[PDB]
């Protein structure tokens, strides 16, 4: 007879999270890799010097 505004809007936020799930999940991974890269670098110094010397 009535109450569908609460039911649909709770189910659009539910599906909104499902659509926002893979975006945050590669943005996220892509973020965790960007650090492996920062940890890898800064060690270029040692390696560069060792090679040139």
């Amino acid at each position: 007879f009535t109450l569908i505004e609460l039911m649909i809007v709770i189910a659009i936020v539910g599906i909104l999270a499902a659509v926002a799930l893979p975006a945050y999940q590669d943005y996220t991974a892509r973020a965790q890799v960007s650090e492996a890269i920062l940890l890898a670098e800064g060690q270029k110094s040692a390696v560069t010097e060792y090679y040139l010397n």
């Binding site: 040692a46 010097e49 060792y50 040139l52 010397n53």
Partner: protein, 52 residues
């Protein structure tokens, strides 16, 4: 440590981890545990006690 060696008429200098002099032409590792770690030493100061 920096130590030298008789070249005969002149001397040559070395640079590296702590050393002790034995005789006028021989030194040896001042092995004791307080030497600056190889990683902190320049490429120009990697000399060994028996470098010639």
């Amino acid at each position: 440590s920096l130590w030298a060696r008789r070249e005969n008429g002149s001397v040559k200098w070395f640079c590296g981890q702590p050393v002790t002099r034995t005789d006028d032409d021989t030194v040896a590792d001042a092995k004791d545990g307080k030497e600056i770690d190889t990683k902190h030493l320049p490429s120009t100061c990697r000399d060994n006690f028996d470098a010639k």
